[PDB]
Amino acid sequence: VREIVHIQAGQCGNQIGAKFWEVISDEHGIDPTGSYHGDSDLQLERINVYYNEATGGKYVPRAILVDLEPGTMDSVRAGQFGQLFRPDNFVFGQSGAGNNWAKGYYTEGQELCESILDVIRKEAESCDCLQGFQLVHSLGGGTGAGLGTLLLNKLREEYPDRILSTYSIVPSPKVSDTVVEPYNCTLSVHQLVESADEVFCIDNEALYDICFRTLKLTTPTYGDLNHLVSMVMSGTTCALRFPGQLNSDLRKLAVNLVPFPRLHFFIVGFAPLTSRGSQQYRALTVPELTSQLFDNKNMMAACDPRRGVYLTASAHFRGRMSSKEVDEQMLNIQARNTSYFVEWIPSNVKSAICDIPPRGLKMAATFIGNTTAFRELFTRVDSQFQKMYARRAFIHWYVNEGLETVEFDEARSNMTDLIQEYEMYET
Amino acid sequence: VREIVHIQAGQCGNQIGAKFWEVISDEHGIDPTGSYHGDSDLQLERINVYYNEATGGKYVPRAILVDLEPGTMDSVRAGQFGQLFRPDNFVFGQSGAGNNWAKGYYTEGQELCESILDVIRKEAESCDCLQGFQLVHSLGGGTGAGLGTLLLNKLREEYPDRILSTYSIVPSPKVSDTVVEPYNCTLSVHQLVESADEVFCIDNEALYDICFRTLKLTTPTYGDLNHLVSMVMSGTTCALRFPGQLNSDLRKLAVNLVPFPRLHFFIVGFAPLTSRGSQQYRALTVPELTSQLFDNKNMMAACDPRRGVYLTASAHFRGRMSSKEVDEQMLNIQARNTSYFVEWIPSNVKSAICDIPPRGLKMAATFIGNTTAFRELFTRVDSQFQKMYARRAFIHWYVNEGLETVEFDEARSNMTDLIQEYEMYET
Amino acid sequence: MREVISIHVGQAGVQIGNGCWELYCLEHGIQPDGQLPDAFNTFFSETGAGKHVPRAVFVDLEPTVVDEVRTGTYRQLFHPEQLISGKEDAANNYARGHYTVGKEIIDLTLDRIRKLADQCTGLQGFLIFHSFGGGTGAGFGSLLLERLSVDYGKKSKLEFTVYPSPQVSTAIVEPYNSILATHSMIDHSDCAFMVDNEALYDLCRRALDIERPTYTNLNRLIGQVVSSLTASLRFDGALNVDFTEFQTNLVPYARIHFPICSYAPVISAEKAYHEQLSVAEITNSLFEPANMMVKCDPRHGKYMACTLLYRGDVVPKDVSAAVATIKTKRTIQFVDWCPTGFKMGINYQPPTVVPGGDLAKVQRAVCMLANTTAIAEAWSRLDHKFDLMYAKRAFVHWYVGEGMEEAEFPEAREDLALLEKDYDEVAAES
Amino acid sequence: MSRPGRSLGLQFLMERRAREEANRFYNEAAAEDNLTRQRAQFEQRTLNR
Ligand SMILES: Nc1nc2c(ncn2[C@@H]2O[C@H](COP(=O)(O)OP(=O)(O)OP(=O)(O)O)[C@@H](O)[C@H]2O)c(=O)[nH]1
Ligand SMILES: Nc1nc2c(ncn2[C@@H]2O[C@H](COP(=O)(O)OP(=O)(O)O)[C@@H](O)[C@H]2O)c(=O)[nH]1
Ligand SMILES: Nc1nc2c(ncn2[C@@H]2O[C@H](COP(=O)(O)OP(=O)(O)O)[C@@H](O)[C@H]2O)c(=O)[nH]1
Ligand SMILES: [Mg+2]
């Protein structure tokens, strides 16, 4: 009984969330019509975490969908497992998909947020327990970035104890699409750093590197890329849903990985990944899983860990295996690569084991780590934002909705110190 | 053997009565031709309350239809249930209604009074027992407001002991079907205060809101609007017709809810109400039922209780259910919102349980409450009447019938004092 | 079961008679011989076999207009005794049409209307049509109502008359007959409607697309209005409106009764296919001054009461929203001692079209009859026109020679001044 | 005293705005009923059908 509330915001979050609920519904065995048609009794032990019960055996997820216009939800309302979602859980505004962060936060956000909060309170105060929330949104956009940070602040004020674990997609460094990314990313960072306990940064270009290389798919669809993200979101909460040899929930994860309140940005990874033709021959073993997780190319964020050093890391494994085999790899991988770890914290690698692996895979692995390599990501947006603010005509568009020019300086002042904060702890 | 005699007055009364007889006839299982083809022995246990039997397997309702013009009656005949009613119970005049209270009360009311009373005597003195009568009429009209109150006084004089339960439709505040309503409503209430034991007030505006916002009907016709009224009127008498774990008839309701003889005006509300497409996803339980009844949006009368305070509340439940669960919610709804109940009466919520629910619904609930929020309803008519009464010329239509102008002053003074009486019991 | 009797006076009355009953027979389905190839008994009586007869009497003081009906296609439907014709018309003279020639035929007609009343078990109301400028319409119309007032008493005498146009005139003696007939109207009429020819011409050209109309086309527009009013008595509806309801709600004072008429949507058969014509659209169109059947701007004055009648796939909820939206407007003024101001009637029978017609097959329509202080604008124009002619005694010799005493001329002028005072006194606020 | 006069007219304009904003909020609920509750279910029915 550790119910987790899933809040979806914007164009980006809705598409990911539709793929995310698709995976869990298959794992527990939920028929797309909403009824349980699974194969195991163990699936019904703790289905309360993500679903609600209806007399008649119909299960509805604890989902809230947020966007400034229905059109994105209408694709989701269409979306294959759409019937599963509760009809009243959809709250959208009467305006366009404004990419301006100030427009989303101030003009249309205030109108939507009051309606959104009470819908969240419907699910928040409906069940026996509530451990933490789960946000999927974008930072380079206007709807997910602007309104998502607004709701995140108000989620904290009412439920300070609960974990604000969020999943964010990062502005790509080489070529993104929305031109005003430096503004939207920089303004969102100040809201993200102080409010969210855990932030997992996802970069498309890393997803655009693994699909090309590892999976060997010439045209993997957007469902494929969101499928890779959906594995990570399923693996983290899998420790709550199923028994295992060594349980590790979100609150365990935050304590070990976060040494200081502002150093909590994380890099995520998943194993195994194999070309769909060569899957037959791979001698998939626990050491084989360890190789993929620590390989730099399997990282879903375009920030090379070799550039910096690790502070903390965590790996989650699924399946009936040897506990000695898992513990020995953490010793082996840590001592062999001591050049990338800090001396003043030994045992930087955390581990966990789960009994039931996902469908099709005899056993799977998930990696979450913290490193100073995030300085590369923020150095990108920092120096790129520098030339933004020297030519202040762009500010008028943000000015038209009441944003003052000091907010740009305040936003840059915050994450610049964040870059400095990661610099000093490298020593 | 607690027979109830049914009286329908006017255009509003007849159309409400027609749909209501469909609902009970379906409930007992009586064909439109009047013969029983039901499905259970239970339906014949106490059908004597509403139906007389014409030997031949035919059941005739204990109903009397009253109107001043024949237009309304002939529509009832053309309906599928037109042949059901006894022909001699159709009592009608041959003059225009007038849409005037004085003309209805004095000019045409006197002539129809003796003819209707003997028809009532036939039904009243035909049964082994008689608990009370039941009237449905509108207050904005001329026949239902005028002639209905005239019969109510005569019924009181001949049968003081019996319960004169009435269902009334109150003029709407924003847009209303008649101009002369402030005169008709004010003069009628004076007659209603001193005569009827129980009066239920219903506003058409709330039915438009409930059907549209809750039931999601894009084009709610009077057929569905009258359908909601029929459920409440069926629910109140359900205890008489069927067994249950705890019985509660009309006289229990009047004893508990009415603390003083003149404070007896009631609000009504019905649950559950769900969109006929969204009904599948609702996990309808006892706690879910209690949420709808006490929600202010489900009140069939446009008088927000939050602006006033509750004096007494009554709840009726139908279906097989837990007695502990029913009793617990009366505790919780009373304790959670203590700001909305009078301190000098503890246990303000009365409860009752019935075994047999209506068709299609496994369980349902009905609410009847008494509150000082009715001061809102009477303020609108009194202020509107005051504007109209200074414009003395509309009275000329009432003077040409013989009504003396002092009757306007007498009616308003009694009505004004009733508002003050509700004020003092707020303290 | 419930009956109303139609009385038609003058050339306008007979020509309107054809215009309306062509719709009734077509709407009900009756062949002009009276056979069939319901509400039949509200307007028609059955004579055995399958033959029906309208419940109407046509009266005029000259045989030309009536003999067209006698020679026309519809001759077999009507009963010979109902069509009553005199010898020589009143020649646009009120005095001639009231005392001299009016009294020659008054008692013949009163037998036929009363004899028709025997076959009405549920008689409630009469309908009477005038043209104010005409002699028989005003002179004989005044004598008809005065007798019918005492013959029957408390029976609704509703009128639907053609007021003189603000400028358009076909008779020079028009101001004299209108004021004199007004005195007879106020005391005896329960409620009397107004339309004027000048506004109908403008509406028949702008909204309805006809370059050049005749009186026949104008008669069909009036026929639609009478049908919508009587639809509540004839056909099923969620909100019926009887005549006796309509008398009480609209008139606030004994002498202020005079309403004004409007219809919507009025649109050509070509352009009517172009719009959905929702209840909100049609309701808004009524309140514009351009659609009004009387050429007086309501914005100059205020409204005292309103009645809206809907014929089509019209749902109660969207009516209340539409009427609520009208109250939001602050160009639609109301006297603040009239808070409610509305009666809505709903009927299910859609409007009926006519071959060779001028309207479209619209699926929903709305009719409006309201009382306004802007009609005092119309009375003022007539009052000033009468004063100029009477100051120099422009036509007195014709009227006095035909039996009328001259003392009636200041009396009718004085009585109109009281009526103007009543409208201004009502316009006052507290 | 016309500037007091607008103060009365402006306050009635605010009253007229607030009186109709309650109806516009109800209209917004009607839009939510048709577009959000019904027509998003229509897209639900769309890919289902
Ligand atoms: N709207 C309309 N008005 C008409 C029609 N026919 C006549 N009128 C009006 O009638 C006026 C002339 O008076 P008459 O038609 O002769 O009416 P009357 O009372 O019979 O007068 P007399 O013929 O002298 O007896 C004209 O000014 C028109 O306004 C018609 O078909 N439609
Ligand atoms: N990985 C992934 N990225 C997406 C998806 N949909 C949109 N994006 C990216 O999200 C970024 C911003 O999208 P935007 O429409 O502004 O989302 P918003 O912030 O919620 O308004 C764009 O650069 C897109 O490339 C998706 O389904 N998956
Ligand atoms: N809810 C509802 N109200 C109705 C119905 N029929 C009439 N009314 C209401 O009754 C009121 C006046 O009815 P009226 O014809 O004057 O009845 P009367 O009392 O006999 O004169 C109007 O405000 C209508 O809204 C109906 O079927 N349902
Ligand atoms: Mg003539």
- Give me the phi and psi of C427, to 5 degrees please: -65, -15
The answer for residues whose C-beta is within 8 angstroms of residue B297's C-beta and 6 or more apart is B209, B210, B213, B214
What is the full DSSP assignment across C186-225? HHH-SEEEEEEHHHHHHHHHHTS--SS--HHHHHHHHHHH
Contact C136 CB / ligand 1 (< 6 Å): yes
Q: Taking a C-beta distance cutoff of 8 angstroms, is the pair C128, C113 a contact?
A: no
Q: Which residues line ligand 3 (CB under 6 A)?
A: B 10-12, 15-16, 97, 99, 138, 140-145, 169, 177, 204, 222, 225-226
Distance from CA of D36 to the nearest CA of C (A): 20
Contact A319 CB / ligand 2 (< 6 Å): no
Q: Taking a C-beta distance cutoff of 8 angstroms, is the pair B339, B400 a contact?
A: no
Q: d(Cα C295, Cα C261) in Å, to the nearest integer?
A: 11
Contact A314 CB / ligand 2 (< 6 Å): no
Nearest ligand to the CA atom of B105: 3
Nearest ligand to the CA atom of B66: 3
Tell me which residue has tokens 């969102």. Answer: A188
Q: d(Cα B333, Cα B340) in Å, to the nearest integer?
A: 10
Q: Does residue A131 sit in helix, strand or coil?
A: coil
Residue type, A353: I
Mutate to test the pocket of ligand 3, among B7, B8, B11 (most ligand atoms within 8 A of CB): B11
Mutate to test the pocket of ligand 1, among C94, C131, C398 (most ligand atoms within 8 A of CB): C131
Distance from CA of A112 to the nearest CA of D (A): 13
The answer for residues whose C-beta is within 8 angstroms of residue A367's C-beta and 6 or more apart is A268, A269, A270, A271, A293, A294, A298, A313, A314, A315, A316
Q: d(Cα A153, Cα C339) in Å, to the nearest integer?
A: 48
Contact C60 CB / ligand 1 (< 6 Å): yes
Q: Taking a C-beta distance cutoff of 8 angstroms, is the pair B155, C322 a contact?
A: no
Disruptive mutation site among C154, C244, C257 for chain B (greatest number of B CBs within 10 Å)? C244
Q: Does the bond joining B160 to the residue before it have cis omega, within 30 degrees of 0? A: no
Q: Taking a C-beta distance cutoff of 8 angstroms, is the pair C179, C412 a contact?
A: yes
Angle separating helix axes B181-195 and B374-390, nearest 10 degrees? 130
Distance from CA of C209 to the nearest CA of B (A): 33
| Residues in chain A preceding a C-to-N separation beyond 2.5 angstroms (breaks) | none
How many angstroms separate the alpha carbon of residue C13 from the centre of ligand 4?
A: 9
Q: Two tokens at B391?
A: 């414009």
Q: Taking a C-beta distance cutoff of 8 angstroms, is the pair A379, A419 a contact?
A: yes
Q: Taking a C-beta distance cutoff of 8 angstroms, is the pair A139, A9 a contact?
A: no
- A31-to-A35, A227, B281, B387, C77 alpha-carbon distances in Å: 5, 19, 14, 64, 72
Chain B residue with minimal CA distance to A58? Answer: B281
How many angstroms separate the alpha carbon of residue C383 from the centre of ligand 1?
A: 21
Q: Two tokens at A17?
A: 């969330």
Contact A149 CB / ligand 2 (< 6 Å): no
Q: Taking a C-beta distance cutoff of 8 angstroms, is the pair B234, B228 a contact?
A: no
If residue C180 lies in a helix (H) or strand (E), which one and from where to where?
helix C174-188
The closest-lying atom of ligand 2 relative to the alpha carbon of residue A178 is 23
Distance from CA of A82 to the nearest CA of D (A): 6
Q: Which of chain C's residues have a Cβ under 8 Å away from the Cβ of B72?
A: 240
What is the full DSSP assignment across B11-77? HHHHHHHHHHHHHHHHHHTB-TTSBB--S-GGGGSSGGGTEEEETTTEEEE-EEEEESSTHHHHHHH
Contact C139 CB / ligand 1 (< 6 Å): no
If residue B347 lies in a helix (H) or strand (E), which one and from where to where?
none
Q: Does residue A368 sit in helix, strand or coil?
A: strand
Q: Two tokens at B262?
A: 């003149």
Q: d(Cα C301, Cα B350) in Å, to the nearest integer?
A: 56
- H-state helical runs in A42-126: 70-78, 101-102, 109-124
Q: Which is nearest to C292 in space by CA: C222, C200, C359? A: C200
Chains C and A touch, contact meaning at least 3 pairs of CB atoms under 8 angstroms apart: no
Nearest ligand to the CA atom of C136: 1
The closest-lying atom of ligand 1 relative to the alpha carbon of residue C197 is 1
According to DSSP, the residues that pair with B366 across neighbouring strands are B270, B316
Chain C residue with minimal CA distance to B16? Answer: C238
Q: Which of chain C's residues have a Cβ under 8 Å away from the Cβ of D20?
A: 328
Nearest ligand to the CA atom of B178: 3
Q: d(Cα A6, Cα A134) in Å, to the nearest integer?
A: 5
How many angstroms separate the alpha carbon of residue C236 from the centre of ligand 3?
A: 14
**Structure-determination approach:** cryo-EM
What are the catalytic residues of C?
A: 245
Q: Does residue C165 sit in helix, strand or coil?
A: coil
Q: Two tokens at A216?
A: 């060997």
The answer for residues whose C-beta is within 8 angstroms of residue A385's C-beta and 6 or more apart is A182, A183, A185, A186, A412
DSSP 8-state class, residue A30: B
Partner-chain contact C324 B175, CB within 8 Å: yes
The closest-lying atom of ligand 1 relative to the alpha carbon of residue C16 is 31
Disruptive mutation site among D23, D34, D35, D38 for chain B (greatest number of B CBs within 10 Å)? D38
From the DSSP assignment, how many helices (H) and strands (E) are in chain D? 2, 0
How many angstroms separate the alpha carbon of residue A374 from the centre of ligand 3?
A: 72
Distance from CA of D11 to the nearest CA of B (A): 20
Partner-chain contact A58 B278, CB within 8 Å: no
How many angstroms separate the alpha carbon of residue A177 from the centre of ligand 2?
A: 9
Beta strands of A17-140 (E only): which ranges?
51-54, 58-61, 63-67, 90-92, 132-138
Instruction: Give yes or no for B276 touching A (CB within 8 A).
Output: no
Q: Taking a C-beta distance cutoff of 8 angstroms, is the pair B90, B134 a contact?
A: no
Residue type, A376: E
- B136-to-A338, B18, B132, B202, B394 alpha-carbon distances in Å: 88, 11, 14, 11, 27
CB crowding C264-284: b at 16 or more within 10 Å, else e: bbbbeeeebeeeebebeebbe
Q: Which of chain B's residues have a Cβ under 8 Å away from the Cβ of D33?
A: 212-213, 216
Q: d(Cα C22, Cα C15) in Å, to the nearest integer?
A: 11
| Residue nearest ligand 2's atom 21 by CA | A143
Q: Two tokens at A351?
A: 């581990």
Partner-chain contact D23 C324, CB within 8 Å: yes
The closest-lying atom of ligand 3 relative to the alpha carbon of residue B9 is 20
Q: d(Cα C97, Cα C173) in Å, to the nearest integer?
A: 13
Q: Which of chain D's residues have a Cβ under 8 Å away from the Cβ of B205?
A: none
Nearest ligand to the CA atom of C63: 4
Resolution (A): 4.2
Q: Is B278 exposed, middle or buried (CB count within 10 Å of its CB: 0-12, 13-18, 19+)?
A: middle
Q: d(Cα C149, Cα C157) in Å, to the nearest integer?
A: 8
Q: Taking a C-beta distance cutoff of 8 angstroms, is the pair B270, B200 a contact?
A: no
Q: Cβ atoms within 10 A of the Cβ of A385, count?
A: 20
Q: Two tokens at A50?
A: 């993500």
Instruction: Give yes or no for B280 touching A (CB within 8 A).
Output: yes
Neighbours of C, requiring at least 3 CB pairs below 8 Å, are B, D
What does the CA dihedral B88, B90, B96, B97 come to, rounded to 10 degrees? 140
Q: Taking a C-beta distance cutoff of 8 angstroms, is the pair C287, C329 a contact?
A: yes
What is the full DSSP assignment across B306-335? GGS-EEEEEEEEESS--HHHHHHHHHHHHH
- Give me the phi and psi of C344, to 5 degrees please: -105, 130
Residues written for chain D? 49
Q: Which is nearest to C188 in space by CA: C115, C137, C254? A: C254
According to DSSP, the residues that pair with C7 across neighbouring strands are C57, C128
Q: Taking a C-beta distance cutoff of 8 angstroms, is the pair A415, A193 a contact?
A: yes
Q: Which is nearest to A56 in space by CA: B362, B276, B288? A: B362
Angle separating helix axes C375-391 and C408-427, nearest 10 degrees? 150
Disruptive mutation site among C317, C327, C422 for chain B (greatest number of B CBs within 10 Å)? C317
- A360-to-A27, A135, A356, B66, B199 alpha-carbon distances in Å: 11, 28, 12, 75, 68
According to DSSP, the residues that pair with C260 across neighbouring strands are C370
Angle separating helix axes B181-195 and B143-158, nearest 10 degrees? 10
What does the CA dihedral C313, C318, C324, C327 come to, rounded to 10 degrees? -40
| Residue nearest ligand 2's atom 12 by CA | A141
| Residue nearest ligand 2's atom 3 by CA | A12
CB crowding C31-69: b at 16 or more within 10 Å, else e: ebebeeeebebbbbbeeeeebbbbbbbbbbbbeebbeeb
- Give me the phi and psi of B321, to 5 degrees please: -155, 170
DSSP 8-state class, residue C349: S
Strands A90-92 and A63-67: parallel
Q: Which of chain D's residues have a Cβ under 8 Å away from the Cβ of C321?
A: 23
Count Cα atoms within 13 angstroms, Cβ side, for A115. Answer: 21
Q: Does residue C391 sit in helix, strand or coil?
A: helix
Instruction: Give yes or no for D44 touching A (CB within 8 A).
Output: yes
From the DSSP assignment, how many helices (H) and strands (E) are in chain C? 16, 12
Instruction: Give yes or no for B402 touching C (CB within 8 A).
Output: no
Beta strands of C298-398 (E only): which ranges?
303-312, 342-347, 364-372
Partner-chain contact D38 B216, CB within 8 Å: yes
Q: Is B75 exposed, middle or buried (CB count within 10 Å of its CB: 0-12, 13-18, 19+)?
A: middle
Residues 11-40, chain D: which have Cβ within 8 Å of B? 26, 29-30, 33-34, 37-38
Q: Two tokens at A134?
A: 């789960």
Strands A51-54 and A58-61: antiparallel
Please state whether A216 falls in left (phi above 0), alpha (psi between -120 and 50) or beta: left
